Ligand binder design. Structure first.
Ligand SMILES: NC(=O)C1=CN2[C@@H]3O[C@H](COP(=O)(O)OP(=O)(O)OC[C@H]4O[C@@H](n5cnc6c(N)ncnc65)[C@H](OP(=O)(O)O)[C@@H]4O)[C@@H](O)[C@H]3O[C@@H]2CC1
Ligand SMILES: CCc1nc(N)nc(N)c1C#C[C@H](C)c1cc(OC)cc(-c2ccncc2)c1
Length: 157
């Protein structure tokens, strides 16, 4: 199973100056439940922006740097190596790798942030004519989650 896993705002912003533009604890928990025990694949810049591999799952970084090495991180140098990864594989970021993978994945787990943030990194355009809405769940607002958001699982028609 090959999935995209992304949070993006109303204009598909996913990042600003190496940071997430929003603070949404419920989405981090969403990320944890989906991807714990499985595989996250990310381009080099997305990994560096995070700074450490995420615990309790395989962390795979795509880069052309043959000296890249980080404890707890498996390195690949080719898009085609993604297809040899066993198990459930989530494409995690960033804009470049999403552009390379959006036409290849089976499904996408999107968190739509119902806001307009300043961004410099974007998720590719996509149309619902190509994706069936398997589920759409509104996140709950509270104390620490103050931006409306929606969990979409989209599956390729
Ligand atoms: N929500 C997010 O996912 C976020 C993502 N991060 C932002 O991405 C911003 C723009 O960089 P972008 O190119 O989109 O990031 P990638 O993660 O896609 O990193 C791209 C890198 O992956 C590598 N890469 C991509 N495609 C390939 C490929 N086909 N073969 C080999 N390496 C590849 C290659 O690394 P390298 O220069 O070390 O070789 C390439 O430059 C960059 O500013 C990162 O900060 C944000 C934080 C929020
Ligand atoms: C969660 C946000 C998020 N949600 C969803 N549904 N999919 C995603 N792909 C990401 C994401 C992301 C990027 C890689 C990112 C950037 C970052 O820049 C600091 C910190 C984190 C991060 C810090 C702590 N724990 C998990 C992830 C993630």
């Amino acid at each position: 199973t090959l999935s995209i896993l992304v949070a993006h705002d109303l204009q598909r912003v996913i990042g600003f100056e190496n940071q997430l533009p929003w603070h949404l604890p419920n989405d981090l928990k969403h990320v944890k439940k989906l991807s714990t025990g499985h595989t996250l694949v990310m381009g080099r810049k997305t990994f560096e922006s995070i700074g450490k591999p995420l615990p309790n799952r395989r962390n795979v970084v795509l880069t052309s740097d043959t000296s890249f090495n980080v404890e707890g991180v498996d390195v690949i140098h080719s898009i085609e190596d993604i297809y040899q990864l066993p198990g459930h594989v989530f494409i995690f970021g960033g804009q470049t790798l999403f552009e390379e993978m959006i036409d290849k994945v089976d499904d996408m787990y999107i968190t739509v942030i119902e806001g307009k943030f300043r961004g410099d990194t974007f998720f590719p355009p996509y149309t619902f004519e190509d994706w069936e809405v398997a589920s759409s769940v509104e996140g709950k607002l509270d104390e620490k989650n103050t931006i409306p958001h929606t969990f979409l699982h989209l599956i390729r028609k």
